[PDB]
Amino acid sequence: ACGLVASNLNLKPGECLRVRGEVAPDAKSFVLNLGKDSNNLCLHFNPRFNAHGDANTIVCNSKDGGAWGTEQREAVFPFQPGSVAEVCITFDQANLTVKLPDGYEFKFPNRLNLEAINYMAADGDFKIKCVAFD
Numbered sequence: 001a002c003g004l005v006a007s008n009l010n011l012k013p014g015e016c017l018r019v020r021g022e023v024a025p026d027a028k029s030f031v032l033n034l035g036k037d038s039n040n041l042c043l044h045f046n047p048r049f050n051a052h053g054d055a056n057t058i059v060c061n062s063k064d065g066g067a068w069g070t071e072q073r074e075a076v077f078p079f080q081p082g083s084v085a086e087v088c089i090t091f092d093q094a095n096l097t098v099k100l101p102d103g104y105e106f107k108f109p110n111r112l113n114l115e116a117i118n119y120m121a122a123d124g125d126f127k128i129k130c131v132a133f134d
């Protein structure tokens, strides 16, 4: 929406998407959206430093045909304003697996059953420096 948008990713099950960026010193929130297109997201990954009444909370959701799913939140927040952070994402039929800094890993249910992740879009206070596949 403001940041990098990539399409035709063809990321297949078990393949790793690695994204490294700079978290702004006064960051309020950033977003990585993954799926088919802007209306169909198997993962909306939204670390909220200070946004929507939330503080240092990772908010996740899906979007299916334009409709937001049921939000999920993690207890941990291994992001620091003003530092570099790497996020590594893979999926299978059941879950997306998101690996974060400081060894933290979590799963978010795969609610869309897409054949591949073809679309990624970044937004907010996170300046993408490197994106890789494998």
Ligand SMILES: OC[C@H]1O[C@@H](O[C@@H]2[C@@H](CO)O[C@](O)(CO)[C@H]2O)[C@H](O)[C@@H](O)[C@H]1O
Residues within 6 Å of the ligand: 044, 046, 052, 059, 060, 061, 068, 071
């Ligand atoms: O669910 C992902 C989306 O959440 C929205 O914010 C939600 C508000 C509506 O503003 O209702 C809540 O569930 C109450 O806390 C918020 O999480 C964001 O506006 C979207 O950008 C997106 O993150």
